[PDB]
């Protein structure tokens, strides 16, 4: 398309000093670059050297995210070199810190910004996006960014970082990814007073106009790019998150990772546990600390797993209890019970606990899952009560970051003599016990699911994503534990091999999508594995050398 | 020319969030920016707030040079806002530290790279340069980067930084500035071992090819851009610096800042000292610690300044003495004598000095100038020796960085008890003696000279720069001091006013060029002040809004 | 700058099928062109073949002017191949015919259009012109297009065609040429009723606004491109033409070809004649048929020639009489005498003619010059009266086109036994007389002057063009007649060698410009010939091949 300085200024084309001598000469770059040819390998090492001479995580974020705006293929190469250590940077927890000071660290814009001031003109904006074949859209209003609450347009970092992991893990063409931020104001007074805030100076609009903007946004996106365009909602308010999932679910090809992706990884760990504890599902009793979107999201998907294994809906629900901030979810309590909690709000026992430890002793659960985000509430005695009740208790401490976790690997494994099966939201290191026996805990990271699922949905031209897709993703993830990894005490495969794990998920989800008539991409491929591997985006530089030859 | 995302990837047009609502809508940026209209001020305050979060100078270099590549108008606004503090960052000393690791911090390339491997195809390379009306070239081989020696292609940071100051100070259009690095190899072993070295992995070619390559380079630039294109040689090795300056002085529009710019700023101080103490020029004698590039440069220019005032050639030279690392330069000594030094190699006194303190006592100088870059060799006893020999002694400690300076301001002013006239290369804060008097010493930075001179040479379409230009530039620098500032012991205007000072220098040089028939820009302007002040480049954002207006139906 | 289809769509870069194999491969053109390499020679022949299979002049114009918008270098090559025959097409007379039907034949726009509706916004328009270093501007209001009168914006063809001859003859870089049309309405009712008219539907504005538009236009041009920018006025109303020349002459670097260029070629022929008739200038009496801009233009320049040869102003004026539509210009006549005619309005004789033949017998002129544009008014007996009075009478029939000429070569040479010295505005073929003696008449074409002058003015950064520049151009033109050409009866060199003639004029005018301190381009060149030849624009294709080589 273009030659000269424009090639170097365009991230998609810019190879940097990896432009070969001929490329330089033939594309009019000779002299604009230093007289040295590099490879993507040399360029990558240079990054790792600079990254080592940096302590601050926020400095690492700003550096690496700058590389995206200079050389795209280098950027995604660098993530793929060591994804485990850099995923903390490009996404959580660091992305939170970046999102807090997002107006300070701003350098170059990265996504698409739709305001409530642009009401009725969303189509004009969408059309300004240079890329023509968008497949994956990630959107946020910024109201519920991680644990940091409302951050307005500073939330844009989340879409951006999310889509980095789409490309990095799954192989979704970056040029077909679109991060979107919906600015309708913000209730965060700190930001309104900040003169470097990048959003609108007004409180959140919660009128009809907000709903209308989302409708128009959804329409505008699909008008330009198609109805099969994948649209993921991220870090919306809990109220908005659920009701928008409901009203668009069967209309637009949309999912919510915070609900559905979270449920999937939760379940995938439970299913990993059942390769150890083979107890009939009839026996499993499950107790959630917290009754948030995370709880309800996970709860529903468990019920659906239980249903596919024999149990009814009514019965499977009665095997799930929830203990939130006001106490145990029971019928006829003064504390509020919302519509989504009603199915898990159960007939009260004789003794009605006022403590979580009290509940564990009364209800005799085989599994406790922590999603309160309210610190260390799985007390040492809670851990013990579970070890007395179950021979191998399943304890899931999912809250993030580490400081909000309900308990620690250390705290879990040692207080149950290394019997329990543990998994966490935040990364804990190998625990060592006094008998010289190693236990390597797994991490319940959402990145196990959404990339693979997203690739499959896109590759199959799927138009709606049913809850049973995430159920199939769960089974798919769990089916990649080797025996060794289970012996070591992992309920998830290593994050190190996320790329491979993401693909195999995409494959197994593609098969399911065709088998249940949710794929509209025909002709149907016979070998789904080949079909997926072939279409994943590679970070290797392509030649940009024009073809010169003699005429014989 | 362009619309959409290209306007934001092009730093000459990119206003960032300073794009108005009208501009965003009409240019198709609406939605690509956050919904927040800023101004150049807010953007600037953001930069200032973030600069404080950084502690390392090198972090700051990387952050600020980054802005040149995102937003050019914003970049030069940031420099002009706080020029005094950020000039250390953008250029010396921090550019030295950056130049050392230039390949380790490389993100985007900034200039034009001509290797020896491109011999015969140099015009090809010149023609790849996007800009069509280049007026100012700064070129480096990389052989003698500051006091760091041979950094080779790492030396590119020097031209890049220096042209920032052309623009920042004098208002020379950035799009007409071309930084160039001639790459002929490097003698530095560490770099030849480095897998991130950005140059050719070979020793410096010192053969005939090197000379040919510089010839070809000079021809190629002036072919494309014209013969009056200003070509400034920077940080070449001594041998080459002088010989090329001689070879091209009369053929192209060229100068060397390390020689001629240094001389101008040196002389500017000496003349300002002369204003304080009306010492007859016959009753002056100059002692240089060091007899290299800086010494020889300042020497040759001083001679002219004396000759101008009445002295002859030989007369003025005999008032200038040089003491190098082998000792005092005297006729028929043991250590060798370069031909440029020969004029300042006199017949030995009766007692040949073996140290510098000796020389001060034997020769009884009025002024010592330190350009050896070898630490605190103006020992306390030397400052005292001068303090007793002269009523008002002039002491110039020009060596950089601070650690290689011959003495501090504190050391100079206390051991002379206020009676000293002091200047240095490195910045020394205010010196407050016990008795109550405060002395603010002048910094003898080259940046006083080269911006103003370059601007003048360019606006007058001058084809050659004789040494009298720098002489005339020196007087122009000296003449901007207030009497109050002379009473404060300043021999140089504040760096806070480098802009006002650079323009005023450019004006006076313009008058000189026209008055002495060295200008070729006719018709000749009458008011030279208005001419210069009108052609300076501004950092204020231009509107990119196309004109919408109504036609009678 | 650019590669691919854009190179082929850009006239300045487009070489057509003359793109070499390597160029095609290296610039991404391989496949977009037919598999055949041509030269500019092959491409040129193709043009000449097509031009031969066309009768209509208007078809030839549309074809060749299309080539300018496809391949610029080919276009100017083709003019330089046979300039003599094609100059009739690109300019007069055909350009007149094209200008009449300009809205019909419109295909692609060619110049810059400034309307009175764009009052106060002329700078915006000027800035829309893509070219950055304009040197030669030709502008028209369209009020007095050739003989066709007011044609409004259809007059744009004139600037365009004029500037074709700038490039074709002189070598003025086409990219530095700017044709401008000032639309202020038109009095031509035929055009106002035409629904394909390309100008404004209103009568000519003759208020202050017109004058103001011209001021702003002049300012805007010079603001962007400089005060030394050459601005030529063409085919303005006679009133406007003179007064605009006067008020801007010493302000903007401006000339008018219809006045000054016309005067120059007139004089150059008179000076050619004086190499035959060596009579002292004191004896020369001159009589103009018509007292138009052409008459007055020529008259003044003659006076200035006479002055440089010894005569005073008052005396030199008395040697010039004028006979216009109302009769002989005499003091105290009922017919109007304008300010410019006053110097040539003389003390009445005893007998005051009412016929032009009557005047020739009374006043005894040695030279008659026809610029009435009113047909054959040099009656056969006029021709004879001149032959009886003078041994070699100088008869100049300058009116155009041929039908408006005052007499013919045939009519002139035979009615004076082949004694007279004749020149015409329109081309007449070699006359043959009954004694087997050939007389080849010259043409008083303005193209002899303005290209050479224009090149010199531009190359010398001249800021004002004095009348004595055109006087020097005249002497320069005449100094290129060989003796043979004078023997044959030519008062001008062949149009065939206009390119060479234009350059030599530019050289001699450059020398004069430096010698009289009108050049601001220093350093001054020592050899003016080399200086000019070096800087003329060539039509040869340049290589567009990027430099590829090995690294030794
Ligand atoms: N660069 C190329 O050579 C190129 C590029 C695109 C398509 N094609 C050709 O077109 C055929 C059909 O391609 P298609 O795109 O219409 O359908 P497809 O069968 O190749 O892909 C199905 C769907 O998945 C999307 N998709 C595929 N890979 C993706 C990725 N890495 N990231 C995001 N979205 C991705 C496509 O846009 C499409 O909507 C291909 O089989 C190939 O022959 C070639
Ligand atoms: N590991 C993962 O993949 C993953 C994914 C999503 C969310 N999470 C984590 O889940 C946690 C909850 O997120 P959420 O979106 O459900 O938030 P939420 O506000 O919707 O849920 C919080 C719930 O905890 C309850 N609670 C608060 N303090 C309590 C206390 N002291 N005792 C008992 N109950 C208490 C609240 O009443 C509420 O029911 C967070 O810490 C978040 O980091 C983890
Ligand atoms: N302040 C300014 O504007 C400015 C401008 C240019 C140069 N300088 C300074 O000038 C200094 C020298 O630069 P240069 O290019 O002339 O270097 P150079 O290598 O050309 O000259 C060094 C000279 O010092 C002599 N020398 C070295 N050690 C000595 C010692 N111990 N005692 C006596 N003489 C000794 C050497 O023999 C030689 O003659 C540097 O420190 C540099 O910072 C300052
Ligand atoms: N061209 C037009 O001509 C007039 C001026 O002509 P000109 O462009 O030759 O300039 P000029 O005649 O005003 O100045 C003469 C020279 O100065 C240069 N120059 C002016 N400002 C400069 C700057 N800020 N940085 C670097 N070089 C600078 C020019 O390129 C030229 O070489 C203006 O009207 C302009 O738009
Ligand atoms: N393509 C090239 O290589 C190229 C192009 C332009 C200039 N140059 C270099 O710049 C030097 C100075 O060029 P300059 O233009 O400033 O001055 P110049 O001395 O070459 O020309 C003087 C003036 O005439 C104009 N001019 C020259 N040739 C012309 C033409 N054919 N048509 C119209 N206008 C014409 C110029 O624009 C200028 O205003 C040249 O001597 C050359 O070294 C090179
Ligand atoms: N050969 C050239 O280079 C050249 C250049 C310019 C104009 N011309 C020709 O000159 C002629 C006049 O052009 P102009 O611009 O001076 O027009 P104009 O209207 O200014 O001049 C016409 C003059 O002829 C007079 N006239 C008209 N009919 C007459 C008659 N029957 N008897 C006597 N006088 C009569 C008018 O009164 C007026 O004085 C045109 O035919 C034009 O083609 C030739
Ligand atoms: C309301 O309190 C919350 C709720 C959810 C979160 C999230 C997480 O705890 C995640 O781990 C999380 C997440 C982390 C990693 C990941 O793949 C890299 C995907 C999601 C989120 O998106 C969250 O919103 C944080 C605080
Ligand atoms: C040989 O040792 C040297 C020689 C010269 C130098 C230079 C300086 O000491 C400068 O101050 C210097 C300089 C510094 C600032 C400036 O304007 C900001 C211009 C020149 C140079 O270019 C040098 O080369 C340093 C060490
Ligand atoms: C008013 O009647 C007129 C006046 C002038 C003309 C012109 C000519 O007769 C030209 O020859 C003429 C011209 C012709 C050729 C040329 O070089 C090719 C330059 C001018 C004009 O520009 C005229 O305006 C025509 C009719
Ligand atoms: Mg989230
Ligand atoms: Mg230097
Ligand atoms: Mg005309």
| A-contacting residues in B 176-235 (Cβ below 8 Å) | 181, 183, 195-200
First-to-last C-alpha distance (Å) of chain C: 28
Bond into A93 cis (ω within 30): yes
Q: Taken in order A536, A542, A546, A551, is the CA torsion positive or negative?
A: negative
Give whole-number Cα distances, A394 to A272, A287, A422, A471, C532, in Å.
11, 10, 6, 20, 94
- Closest to B466 in 3D by CA, of B263, B310, B291: B263
Percent of chain A that is helix, strand, coil (3-state, to 5): 45, 10, 40
> What span, in angstroms and rounded, lies between the C-alpha atoms of A441 and B84?
55
- Closest to B141 in 3D by CA, of B100, B182, B201: B182
Pairing of strands A437-439, A431-433: antiparallel
> What span, in angstroms and rounded, lies between the C-alpha atoms of A443 and A408?
12
Provide the β-strand partners of residue C114.
C182
Give whole-number Cα distances, C368 to A158, A236, C277, C294, C390, in Å.
91, 95, 15, 14, 11
Give whole-number Cα distances, C390 to C283, C409, C437, in Å.
12, 18, 21
User: Number of C-alpha atoms within 13 angstroms, CB side, residue C433?
Assistant: 15
> What span, in angstroms and rounded, lies between the C-alpha atoms of C402 and B425?
83
Bond into A503 cis (ω within 30): no
Q: Please tell me the residue having the least CA distance from ligand 6 atom 1.
A: C425
DSSP state of C146: T
CB C502 within 8 A of CB C478: no
DSSP state of A153: G
Q: Taken in order A18, A23, A27, A32, is the CA torsion positive or negative?
A: positive
Binary contact (A547, C25; C-beta < 8 A): yes
Using a CB-CB cut-off of 8 Å, the residues of chain B touching C176 are: none
Those residues whose C-beta lies under 8 Å from the C-beta of residue C170, and which sit 6 or more positions away, are: C451, C452, C454, C455, C502, C503, C506, C536
Percent of chain C that is helix, strand, coil (3-state, to 5): 45, 10, 40
Point out residues after which chain B has a gap (C–N over 2.5 Å). none
CB A145 within 8 A of CB A154: yes
How many helices (H) and strands (E) chain A has is answered by 23, 14
Backbone phi, then psi, for B389, in 5-degree steps?
Answer: -70, -40
Ligand nearest to the CA of B88: 8
Site to substitute for ligand 2 among A260, A268, A292, most atoms within 8 A of C-beta: A292
> What span, in angstroms and rounded, lies between the C-alpha atoms of A460 and A436?
49
Those residues whose C-beta lies under 8 Å from the C-beta of residue A544, and which sit 6 or more positions away, are: A7, A13, A15, A19, A23, A27
Bond into B523 cis (ω within 30): yes
Structure tokens at C212: 């103001």
Binary contact (C463, B523; C-beta < 8 A): yes
CB B420 within 8 A of CB B401: no
Backbone phi, then psi, for C138, in 5-degree steps?
Answer: -120, 130
Return the active site residues of A: 91, 162
Q: Please tell me the residue having the least CA distance from ligand 1 atom 9.
A: A535
User: Number of C-alpha atoms within 13 angstroms, CB side, residue C273?
Assistant: 28
> What span, in angstroms and rounded, lies between the C-alpha atoms of A319 and A285?
5
> What span, in angstroms and rounded, lies between the C-alpha atoms of B361 and A249?
95
Where are the alpha helices (H) located in A206-312, listed in sequence order? Answer: 208-225, 238-252, 262-273, 293-308
CB atoms within 10 A of CB A49: 12
Give whole-number Cα distances, C467 to B472, C238, C257, C264, C463, in Å.
44, 18, 12, 9, 13
CB C117 within 8 A of CB B552: yes
What length does chain B have? 553
From B109, B124, B156, residue closest to A30, measured CB to CB: B124
CB-based burial of residue B15 (10 Å sphere; 0-12 exposed, 13-18 middle, 19+ buried)?
buried
DSSP A7-21: HHH-TTT--GGGS-H
CB C155 within 8 A of CB C99: yes
DSSP state of B260: I
Backbone phi, then psi, for C288, in 5-degree steps?
Answer: -100, 130
Distance C69 CA to ligand 4 centre (A): 32
Using a CB-CB cut-off of 8 Å, the residues of chain C touching B220 are: none
> What span, in angstroms and rounded, lies between the C-alpha atoms of B531 and B460?
10
What is the torsion angle, in degrees rounded to the nearest 10, for the CA atoms of residue C263, residue C265, residue C266 and residue C272? 140
Chains A, B: CB contacts within 8 A come to 136
CA-based nearest distance C546→chain A, Å: 6
Say if residue C538 carries a ligand binding annotation: no
Maximum C-alpha span of chain B: 99
- Closest to B418 in 3D by CA, of B427, B426, B409: B409
CB A365 within 8 A of CB A392: no
| C-contacting residues in B 124-153 (Cβ below 8 Å) | 124
Say if residue A38 carries a ligand binding annotation: no
> What span, in angstroms and rounded, lies between the C-alpha atoms of B461 and B229?
8
Inter-axis angle of helices B262-276 and B293-309, nearest 10: 50
Map B306-355 to HEC letters.
HHHHCCCHHHHHCCEEEECCCCECECCCCCCCCCCCHHHCECCCCCCCCC
Bond into C500 cis (ω within 30): no
What length does chain A have? 552
Classified as helix, coil or strand, B170 is: helix
Tell me, using a 6 A CB cutoff, whether residue A291 lines ligand 2.
yes
| A-contacting residues in C 492-551 (Cβ below 8 Å) | 546-549, 551
Using a CB-CB cut-off of 8 Å, the residues of chain C touching B26 are: none
Atom of ligand 3 nearest to the CA of B296: 16
Resolution attained, angstroms = 2.5
> What span, in angstroms and rounded, lies between the C-alpha atoms of A311 and A317?
10
Backbone phi, then psi, for A295, in 5-degree steps?
Answer: -60, -55
Q: In angstroms, how far is CA B52 from the centroid of its own chain?
A: 27
Q: Ramachandran region of residue B31, left (φ > 0), alpha (ψ -120 to 50) or beta?
A: left
Inter-axis angle of helices A40-52 and A72-81, nearest 10: 60
Q: In angstroms, how far is CA B488 from the centroid of its own chain?
A: 25
Return the active site residues of B: 91, 162
Bond into A496 cis (ω within 30): no
Vertex B182: Cα angle to A46 and C545 (nearest 5): 90
E strand or H helix at C276: none
E strand or H helix at C163: helix C157-165
Atom of ligand 8 nearest to the CA of B401: 9
Inter-axis angle of helices A83-90 and A72-81, nearest 10: 120
Say if residue B526 carries a ligand binding annotation: no
Those residues whose C-beta lies under 8 Å from the C-beta of residue C9, and which sit 6 or more positions away, are: none
Query: What is chain C's Cα-based Rg?
Result: 25
Q: Ramachandran region of residue B398, left (φ > 0), alpha (ψ -120 to 50) or beta?
A: alpha
Those residues whose C-beta lies under 8 Å from the C-beta of residue C411, and which sit 6 or more positions away, are: C376, C378, C380, C383
Question: Which of C462, C523, C525, C542 to mutate: most B Cβ within 10 Å?
Answer: C523
Neighbours of ion ligand 10 (CB under 5 A): A 235, 258
CB C320 within 8 A of CB C301: no
Pairing of strands B438-439, B431-432: antiparallel
Backbone phi, then psi, for B255, in 5-degree steps?
Answer: -155, 165
DSSP state of B38: -
Classified as helix, coil or strand, B181 is: strand
Tell me, using a 6 A CB cutoff, whether residue C444 lines ligand 6.
yes
> What span, in angstroms and rounded, lies between the C-alpha atoms of B155 and B226?
26
DSSP state of B204: P
The tokens 């500035």 sit on which residue? B177
DSSP C196-263: T--S-SSPPP-SHHHHHHHHHHHHHHHHHH-TT-EEEE-S--HHHHHHHHHHHHHHH-EEEIIIIIHH
Where are the alpha helices (H) located in A157-196, listed in sequence order? Answer: 157-165, 189-193
Maximum C-alpha span of chain A: 95
Binary contact (B522, C520; C-beta < 8 A): yes
CB B113 within 8 A of CB B156: yes
The tokens 């074809």 sit on which residue? C63
Provide the β-strand partners of residue C423.
C396, C442
CB atoms within 10 A of CB B189: 10
> What span, in angstroms and rounded, lies between the C-alpha atoms of C402 and C424?
9
Q: Is C336 a catalytic residue?
A: no
Provide the β-strand partners of residue C394.
C367, C421
Pairing of strands B253-256, B230-233: parallel
Using a CB-CB cut-off of 8 Å, the residues of chain A touching B100 are: none
């Amino acid at each position: 398309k273009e030659k000269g300085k424009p090639l170097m200024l365009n991230p998609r084309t810019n190879k940097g000093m990896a432009f070969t001598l001929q490329e330089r000469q033939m594309l009019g770059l000779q002299g604009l670059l230093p007289p040295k040819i590099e490879t993507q390998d040399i360029q990558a090492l240079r990054f790792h050297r600079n990254l080592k001479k940096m302590t601050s995580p926020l400095e690492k974020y700003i550096y690496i995210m700058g590389i995206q705006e200079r050389n795209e293929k280098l950027f995604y190469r660098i993530l793929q070199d060591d994804i485990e250590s850099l995923m903390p940077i490009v996404y959580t927890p660091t992305v939170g810190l970046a999102c807090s000071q997002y107006g300070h660290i701003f350098r170059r814009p990265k996504g698409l910004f739709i305001s409530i001031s642009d009401r009725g003109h969303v189509r004009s904006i969408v059309d300004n996006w240079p890329e023509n074949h968008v497949k994956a859209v990630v959107v946020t209003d910024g109201e519920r960014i991680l644990g940091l609450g409302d951050l307005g347009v500073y939330g844009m970092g989340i879409p951006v970082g999310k889509l980095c992991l789409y490309t990095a893990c799954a192989g979704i063409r970056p040029d077909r990814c679109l991060p979107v931020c919906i600015d309708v104001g913000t209730d965060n007074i700190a930001l309104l007073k900040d003169p470097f805030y990048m959003g609108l100076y007004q409180k959140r609009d919660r009128t009809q106009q907000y709903d209308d903007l989302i409708d128009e946004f959804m329409k505008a996106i699909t008008d330009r790019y198609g109805r099969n365009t994948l649209i993921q909602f991220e870090d919306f308010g809990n109220h908005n998150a659920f009701r928008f999932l409901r009203k668009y679910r069967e209309k637009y090809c949309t999912f919510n990772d915070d609900i559905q992706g979270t449920a999937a990884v939760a379940l995938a760990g439970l299913l990993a546990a059942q390769k150890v504890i083979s107890k009939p599902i009839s026996e499993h009793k499950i107790l959630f600390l917290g009754a948030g979107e995370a709880a309800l999201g996970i709860a529903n998907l468990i019920v659906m797993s239980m249903v596919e294994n024999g149990l009814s809906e009514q019965e499977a629900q009665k095997k799930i209890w929830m203990f939130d901030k006001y106490g145990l979810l029971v019928k006829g309590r003064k504390a509020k019970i919302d519509s989504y909690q009603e199915p898990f709000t159960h007939s009260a026992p004789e003794s009605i606990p006022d403590t979580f430890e009290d509940a564990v002793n009364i209800l005799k659960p085989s599994t406790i899952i922590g999603v309160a985000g309210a610190g260390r509430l799985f007390t040492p005695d809670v851990i013990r009560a579970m070890a007395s009740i179950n021979e191998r208790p399943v304890i899931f401490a999912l809250s993030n970051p580490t400081a909000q976790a309900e308990c620690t690997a250390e705290e879990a494994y040692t207080l149950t003599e290394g019997r329990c099966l543990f998994a966490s939201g935040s990364p804990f290191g190998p625990v060592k016990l006094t008998d010289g026996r190693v236990f390597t805990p797994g991490q319940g990271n959402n990145v196990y699911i959404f990339p693979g699922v997203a690739l499959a949905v896109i590759l199959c031209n799927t138009r709606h994503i049913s809850d049973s897709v995430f159920l199939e993703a769960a089974k798919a993830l769990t089916s990649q534990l080797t025996d060794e990894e289970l012996a070591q005490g992992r309920l998830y495969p290593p994050l190190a091999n996320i790329q491979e794990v993401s693909i195999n998920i995409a494959i197994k989800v593609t098969e399911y999508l065709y088998a249940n008539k949710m794929a509209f991409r025909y002709p149907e491929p016979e070998d789904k594995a080949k079909y997926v591997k072939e279409r994943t985006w590679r970070s290797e530089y392509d030649s940009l050398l024009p073809d010169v030859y003699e005429w014989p």
